[PDB]
Design a protein around this nucleic acid. Structure first.
Length: 89
DNA sequence: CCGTTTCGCTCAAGTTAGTATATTAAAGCTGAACGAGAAACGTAAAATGATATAAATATCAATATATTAAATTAGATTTTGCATAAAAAACAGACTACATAATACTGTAAAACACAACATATGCAGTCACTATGCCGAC
């Protein structure tokens, strides 16, 4: 299609539908979280979380389009999901 | 071919993610009104093109010889650029003399208002009428 992410009709797809079809597989996958379950937007958080350990921190700060140095530590939090494993370093 | 149900869409109310400015200071942009000198135009007048023919005047080569305007000097001199310096007049730097304001001090009338006993119109105090439909009563 004309867009990198099109539909089954070779036509663009709204942003308020790409996440909808993502929630279905979420509940169908049979998961279990604390409080409000994740979402499609969380893919941006997981991407940066991996881009911080794979390469560096200065890399997962420009790719996301961020410039400030206040949310670089807030978008790195875990909120109480997986314990921040502290290695020898 | 047509009807029925699911699915792609957008409206409506909650749930999150991101970035952070106000005054000074000094311009810069652009619509609209303001104020002369030179040349292209144009009608009118002056000079010239038009036009031709026998007779009058100029066209010109090739060289001797007297004549002359005038650039080319070459020396003479007013003209022109530039100060130098003193006689002569302007003008601060002094100073007493002279008429004039700010001030020193005496001399005198009178403005400006409290104080006090009366005098009394006038606003305030107290009651009834003027002027005309309410309220209450019938229709």
């Amino acid at each position: 299609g004309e867009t990198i992410i099109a539909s089954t009709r070779r036509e663009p797809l709204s942003s308020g539908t790409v996440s909808r079809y993502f929630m279905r597989a979420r509940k169908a996958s049979g998961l279990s979280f604390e409080g409000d379950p994740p979402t499609f937007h969380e893919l941006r958080s997981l991407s940066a979380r991996l881009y911080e350990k794979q390469i560096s921190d200065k890399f997962a700060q420009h790719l996301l389009g961020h410039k400030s140095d206040t949310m670089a530590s807030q978008y790195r939090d875990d909120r109480g999901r997986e314990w921040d494993k502290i290695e020898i370093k």
